[PDB]
Amino acid sequence: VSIDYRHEMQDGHKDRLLISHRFANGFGLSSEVKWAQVSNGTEVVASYVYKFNSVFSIEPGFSLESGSSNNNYRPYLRGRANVTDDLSVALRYRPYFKRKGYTLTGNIDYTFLKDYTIGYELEYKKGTSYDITHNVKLSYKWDKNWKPYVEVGNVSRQTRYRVGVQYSFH
Ligand SMILES: CCCCCCCCOCCOCCOCCOCCO
Ligand SMILES: CCCCCCCCOCCOCCOCCOCCO
Ligand SMILES: CCCCCCCCOCCOCCOCCOCCO
Ligand SMILES: CCCCCCCCOCCOCCOCCOCCO
Ligand SMILES: CCCCCCCCOCCOCCOCCOCCO
Ligand SMILES: CCCCCCCC
Ligand SMILES: CCCCCCCC
Ligand SMILES: CCCCCCCC
């Protein structure tokens, strides 16, 4: 189980608290509460990660969000390839049916010096009623329980900044 708090600003603000767990069988569940300045929301996600082998995995997922402004059903399929022990790549297709469109999100993540991770995320969003996002995240496993992190992204025009920390139970 982990609990992840994150603050976001551009150049109002957004905050979130995301609690999640992935079981050794592959089943995962998360619940997130979000507030922004006012709006609020909650999201729940259930998924299975199915590992074909040490390199390739596929993760179908189900999510519903309920809010002031965002209210969507967003199922998804995420494929992952471990290129090396330190380097992974993923691609996620996530349509949204909200009150429709889809996002396509690619991720490249590289772990170095045991405790650091640098991640690049490219996200393409297209409505049916496009935007491209570039994001860089840097995380540091400070100890067995705490993983602070920062993200800087460009949303296309403007910059989106996040700071957060993930606490893991042991
Ligand atoms: C939701 C904020 C980000 C996740 C941190 C909450 C984890 C709760 O377990 C904390 C146990 O270790 C902390 C011991 O120090 C107590 C500090 O109390 C603040 C907890 O909210
Ligand atoms: C395995 C299928 C999907 C798992 C969903 C689990 C969540 C079920 O909880 C429903 C109970 O509602 C609690 C309070 O409702 C607040 C609104 O919920 C936010 C998103 O629906
Ligand atoms: C992006 C569309 C293709 C991805 C598969 C659809 C996922 C939504 O499935 C709906 C069923 O919801 C229940 C699933 O909850 C258990 C976790 O397993 C994920 C399978 O959906
Ligand atoms: C790893 C398996 C799961 C990954 C998703 C499976 C299928 C994804 O289809 C993508 C749908 O978009 C079609 C065109 O792709 C456009 C790529 O981005 C450039 C924008 O034109
Ligand atoms: C081992 C690979 C993983 C590390 C990759 C991290 C660095 C990747 O940086 C690419 C991010 O590109 C950001 C582009 O910024 C958008 C510029 O938009 C114009 C300014 O408004
Ligand atoms: C099992 C720990 C995550 C909690 C998710 C709650 C879903 C309603
Ligand atoms: C993995 C079984 C379901 C866990 C749900 C925890 C309470 C909402
Ligand atoms: C301490 C040097 C500044 C690092 C800048 C990083 C900007 C993304």
From Swiss-Prot:
Stored InterPro entries: Bact_OM_Channel_sf, Oligogalacturonate-sp_porin
Matching Gene3D superfamilies: monomeric porin ompg
Induction (UniProt): Induced by pectin or pectin derivatives. Controlled by KdgR, ExuR, PecS and catabolite repression via CRP.
UniProt key word Ion transport: yes
Keywords in alphabetical order: Cell outer membrane, Ion transport, Membrane, Porin, Signal, Sugar transport, Transmembrane, Transmembrane beta strand, Transport, Virulence
Keyword field contains Transport: yes
Family according to the record: Belongs to the oligogalacturonate-specific porin KdgM (TC 1.B.35) family.
Function text: Porin specific for oligogalacturonides. Also required for full virulence.
Record's protein name: Oligogalacturonate-specific porin KdgM
Organism: Dickeya dadantii (strain 3937) (Erwinia chrysanthemi (strain 3937))
